[PDB]
């Protein structure tokens, strides 16, 4: 319920844009709610294969609106918690395009995305410690996993901002793209995902995101899924299309 | 002459070479079986300390042969599954030297190797998604662990090929070596492993490959093993050799 | 009592190894003094952060060989006690390394929160060449940081490596000229000491909690986060922001 | 001569080597056709930019060996003509490379303005192994780009190298999956073609002017710059900015 | 209140651009004040090093557009005077950049001796998009630093770039969190200021002497070097070393 | 006339080793002289194709002996100047293996080498400014050319030491190699150079080291040399060897 979040579907891609550009997309409760709603619609909508999350023309998100944030009674059960769970649990792929400010949740959300592109000026920051609080959105797990404990301590314990150099080096983003081409490029990546066979793609994502386990268990797990694929129409169409020297159509 | 998988032992190293060069070492059932055979033999063979896996002079492996692959009833229990489990479970060290094509299993095998060198033109690819299937050989776990989820998504979800830059950056390979020296260099690394005390080296590998656990448990685990080493001949030989100003010989 | 020096300044407990003539090769007395220093610091309310240093030329060449040939076991030994003391330290630990960082000189570093190294620091885990196995959790930490193959150079080939690798795999945060090394490490310790200790400790504990299913981690972080919303540290951060001043978290 | 294909689209002259059966190993007729294509493009007012391509599998394996053994000289040869045509081209040149880039396939690239390469690309300058010296200015361009030692691996050891090195020393802009390589290179060519030609050409000429004492270069740039202040391209840029629209530099 | 602030502390002349409301977009009066500040600092015996700063959010968004449309020429202009003042400055120049570094904000940096940037810094040389050419020697300095192809992304495609590229091509020395940026740049300025000025200046002049045949350069260095052997700076360095103290090169 | 520098020839490689390990190979006049002599001999010796420069088992060179250095009347025309010119002007290839200290001349020499390998603990330093002097050996030109002006200013103006990370990134060294394999690896690189055809290799090096010039002039220059190679025995042997499916022997 706000014009602060815009959402629409094009060619199998649900575009979800934060739209409070005057405050650098600093988030408030109504935006979290609209964002959670957009994920729930997209997750249930058969015309949607992939999500694409965008910000303004100058910023992704400056994180929570600070006055608003100081009035939170809890994080547990809050609307912010709902949004984060909606993204962390999304079965469909999620692409993000970031630029300018990516602060707090603007950064800690990115590890739940499948692909992320950033503009040259992007500034990442997780300043929880400087507000007397702890990190959210699973960043206490995802950052050390990606960057190692020491480089993640610069982010979380020193509370220091970082740039695209570090973000790409630790695997937080896939690459840096000039702002004028950023949305087009992220959209091209979304389409390329949307042209894969959804039911398989979703299984791949779910396996990737399954907690790590003893290797023999994982082999068994992958193989069980794999067996089902051998019988499927997607494989059939992929082979057929390869033979006939054409692009597959997986609808 | 031209069996599809060649195997022989030199200086503690079992060389296992895929040899279907005309099809860029695209794998069929018989190769998987021969390869699993070679691992079982090397694992049991007391003259073998280390494996070295090689391809042709131009390619490592272009993955499964497609005609053969369309014959599969299942991956579970198949001969390909057997090969993969043989490598994933190998107690002895495994060195690989890759070049040209490393596709499908040619790539997804590499995380189970202990050292890997690649030639400059190597092309890595996991195109499962473009065939309507899912990744195998534990790559759904090993790729995201090595590269992080987003780079691994380029590999697995976009199904895009990648090169030696990425492969080295995410720790899939140790380094890039000019093709004319690739085999020699991989072999030198194998020999260097083979000269270590086998019984200890195997324990180090097993620890390294033990699933991660709470840190205090791991300390306890390492220490238990470590305690047995303090009493061992390998330590004794290392110290003796140091005192007598000579290179240790751990071959006994 | 001359081989290990310890003192507290500005919330930082400095712990220095001081056997420079043998490149800080450790013996039982040092381990005991080092373990004691961590126990004191962990209990001392005036201490927020530890800073571990070596000599002016070396961090540590690892165990002294004569002493080592006296060990009955690693389990239960004084070396074990030291290692546990660091691995289990609730407060942050910063290290500054240079010259030799061998054996325990290297395998200790993954338990540190920040680590700076001089140009020409030489890292080495030569356990295999002594017929023994790696200690201090390195069989887990090195593969997690470097990946299995690059860790196999270190642990299976037993090869030394340099600052290039150490930084690339996240063993250290950066390389700093020797003449500025201690000052820089100290500045980083002070910066950590100026954070709110009770929150900082929670952040470290979350970061070091074994990875778990993502929804569980979200729940875990949120439970801690909820407690922070009611805390003095948040209150001081806000107050300080309002009054246009730097926060003092000695509260 | 269907060994070289050339055509113009949207201001871009596409020049494709087309002897896929021999991995585009070059012979005299190809060099002549290539030189002709550059001369046409350089004189053609409908052409703003060149795009040079190979087969679907290779860029060029260098000189065909049988042909090469018949050369009386490099000086004055048709190969020399081609090289000079590209080195001297006033308009921008984009290349997309893959598979083999050997001999001239590599040594040509420093004359290009933008270069994209596929993941499997193999670069090689094996002159020393044939008892000859490097050509196409590589004795100068490689040391300038890579430094003398890394260039000695290429030229004195005669070792092939990959995309890691090529990107690190600035031989190529980036690595692009083969299925998107041509599209991406073409997009870059179009982007260049949409710039104001007369300015772009000046920029390229300045960039390629031999380095000189800094004050001379300031003078040189400024003289050109002064002419631009009076030009239509500036005028269009400003007009377009005022009217809140994209500029059209076709005028 | 004035648009350029300048003052001296501990041998360092701080020169700060101060039009924060327009992101330090430059006008003629600033160029004149900046050139004035350099002339003064160059002559002033109490000054050893310059430190150039911007606002708390931006370095410089380049020329103010209204002012720029007033220029009759770049040759001889006040902008030219400023650029020459920096390019020709005999004393060392350190810069600390953040936010916008556009046009001259970027093309100035190659004339600096050290440069630190904040995480969000956005570098841009959009000359081509304005129908003009690059200035401040960038047609020479960018290709030298980045190689021709990566420089073509900056100058021919006119694309902005970030701290990843800037550090990789040697345009900056490092990235530093905004809250520590000025302090760190200052610490570097002080460290330069504590060197012996007359020597330091000679080192800078040699470094900036156009490249020449190697034997000539050896001869050149040696001639200067011979003069140093007789100098007070060497004498003070040795003396200070003997007496186990820090040298004071104010002599 | 000193045992402070050891020199000998093996398999076309002249090994030149600094041998004052007690002072980390800090250089004095007699070492400069012996080193210059070794280059002059090698340059004139037909059995020598390549130089290999080595230090002690722990250090390359800590630079000039400081007490000695404070007594120099001049650098121009000194024995140190002679050495530097000998290496800078050497027509034959030069490979170096460095470790531990590489200070002053220990660093500023390396840009005149064709290949350089370094051990993990190597510490590079050009502290001229802290001694009130300027850089030597062409470093005022070579460092900025390699590293760019700003990173070179850390080295030369701030006078700060740096490590193998930076040295490899700016192209000062080819790579890092574990100390126990350093000399072997550098030697292998020397031998690989020594197996190339000397007369051609020398021309390649001379072209590489020719000052940069307008591109058309360089094309002309290369082509003139190239024309001479088309008539040479080295090309002939390369082709012949290729046809007969054997390794070339460029010894004659």
């Amino acid at each position: 319920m706000s014009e602060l979040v815009l959402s629409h579907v094009e060619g199998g891609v649900q575009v979800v844009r934060m739209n409070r550009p005057d405050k650098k997309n600093a988030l408030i409760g109504e935006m979290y709610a609209a964002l959670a709603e957009a994920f729930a619609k997209g997750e249930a909508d058969d015309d949607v294969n992939v999500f694409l999350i965008l910000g303004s023309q100058t910023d992704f998100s400056a994180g929570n609106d600070l006055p608003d944030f100081l009035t939170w009674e809890a994080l547990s059960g809050s609307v912010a918690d709902r949004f984060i769970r909606a993204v962390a649990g999304a079965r469909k792929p999620v692409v993000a395009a970031v630029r300018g400010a990516a602060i707090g949740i603007g950064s800690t959300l990115l590890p739940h995305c499948d692909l992320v592109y950033a503009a040259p000026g992007t500034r990442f920051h997780m300043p929880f410690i400087n507000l007397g609080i702890v990190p959210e959105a699973g960043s206490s797990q995802t950052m050390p996993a990606l960057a190692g404990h020491r480089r993640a301590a610069e982010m979380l314990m020193l509370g220091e901002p970082f740039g695209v150099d570090t973000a790409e080096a630790v695997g937080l983003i896939n690459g840096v793209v000039p702002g004028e081409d950023l949305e087009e490029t992220a959209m091209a990546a979304a389409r390329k995902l949307a042209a894969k066979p959804r039911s398989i793609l979703v299984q791949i994502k779910a396996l990737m995101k399954t907690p790590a386990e003893p290797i023999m268990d994982r082999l068994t797990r992958e193989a069980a899924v794999f067996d089902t694929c051998l019988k499927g129409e997607a494989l059939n169409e992929a082979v057929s299309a390869f033979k006939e020297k054409r692009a597959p159509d997986f609808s």
Side-chain angles (χ1 to χ4, degrees), chain A residues 27-245:
Chain A
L27 300 176
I28 56 174
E30 53 185 282
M31 294 175 73
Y32 287 118
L35 291 166
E37 200 175 63
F39 275 77
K41 295 152 151 41
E43 281 280 286
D45 186 349
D46 195 67
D47 297 313
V48 172
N49 289 359
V50 177
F51 292 96
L52 170 61
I53 306 164
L54 305 176
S56 80
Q57 290 321 105
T58 61
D59 294 280
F60 185 66
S61 175
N64 276 289
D65 179 83
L66 173 65
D68 177 84
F69 169 70
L70 299 174
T71 84
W72 290 8
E73 148 182 50
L75 175 60
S76 303
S78 69
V79 74
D81 186 32
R82 220 180 75 192
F83 169 56
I84 293 156
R85 291 174 183 266
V87 180
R91 299 273 305 188
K92 301 179 185 179
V94 179
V95 179
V98 310
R99 69 208 301 169
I103 300 172
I105 184 59
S107 277
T108 57
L109 184 71
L110 301 179
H112 307 292
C113 299
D114 299 289
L115 300 172
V116 183
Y117 301 87
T122 308
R123 190 178 165 271
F124 301 89
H125 198 184
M126 288 166 215
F128 309 101
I129 184 55
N130 296 321
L131 281 53
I133 61 176
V134 305
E136 76 201 359
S139 51
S140 70
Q141 179 165 300
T142 57
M143 299 311 159
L146 285 168
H149 181 77
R150 279 139 305 277
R151 178 79 73 211
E154 288 178 44
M155 303 168 180
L156 300 184
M157 289 177 59
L158 290 180
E160 284 177 357
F162 59 97
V164 294
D165 55 339
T166 301
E168 186 164 5
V170 308
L172 192 65
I173 64 183
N174 287 266
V176 178
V177 180
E180 66 253 38
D181 296 329
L182 169 68
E183 293 193 11
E184 256 157 354
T185 303
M187 174 60 91
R191 285 192 196 281
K192 189 174 172 162
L193 288 170
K196 307 310 199 203
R198 185 173 58 198
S199 52
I200 309 304
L201 193 54
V202 156
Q203 291 299 309
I204 289 178
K205 176 168 168 171
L207 283 166
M208 284 173 78
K209 291 184 68 167
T210 299
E213 65 196 321
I215 196 59
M216 303 298 160
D217 296 344
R218 176 55 65 104
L219 290 176
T220 293
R221 188 186 304 280
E222 287 173 340
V225 178
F226 191 106
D227 291 337
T228 301
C229 299
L230 288 172
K231 314 293 162 174
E233 70 209 316
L235 172 54
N236 195 267
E237 174 55 13
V239 169
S240 157
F242 181 73
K243 293 195 130 166
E244 298 158 21
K245 191 189 169 177

Side-chain angles (χ1 to χ4, degrees), chain A residues 9-25:
Chain A
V9 179
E10 259 177 64
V13 178
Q14 187 162 320
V15 180
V16 177
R17 183 189 297 274
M18 296 172 280
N19 189 39
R20 191 180 183 215
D22 286 346
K23 301 220 193 303
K24 304 192 220 263
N25 289 339

